[PDB]
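ERR on first pass: missing label on line 2. Operator R.T. fixed the label and resubmitted. Corrected input:
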Amino acid sequence: VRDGYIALPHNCAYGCLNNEYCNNLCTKDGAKIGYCNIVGKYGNACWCIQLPDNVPIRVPGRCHPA
Amino acid sequence: VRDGYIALPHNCAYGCLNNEYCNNLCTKDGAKIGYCNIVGKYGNACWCIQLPDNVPIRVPGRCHPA
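pass 2 clean. output:
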């Protein structure tokens, strides 16, 4: 498992206004919990705790939206 | 141990701009890790994970300055 900003395809973060949203999103993807965390995206983005290793997270670099 | 917004008297949270700060603050106080998460209308605050029970966290109610 690992922590990170869960990614939208490809390498794009989920912007957020609410911790509740990130908790829903992260847990549906198998994480323990999620938070709406400062500046993964300009503003805040969802950061998940103990996501399964097979779920992609954001890495430094560009967002290439599918 | 419990998770929460580490508190400054009186029942005030620590505002933040970077995760690094919250991580330092939380871990120096015995928490596992810390994050700078959303805490309302345009503002973020430090959230600590598994903060020991000798360190106060925010509870419902207003922040009373000083």
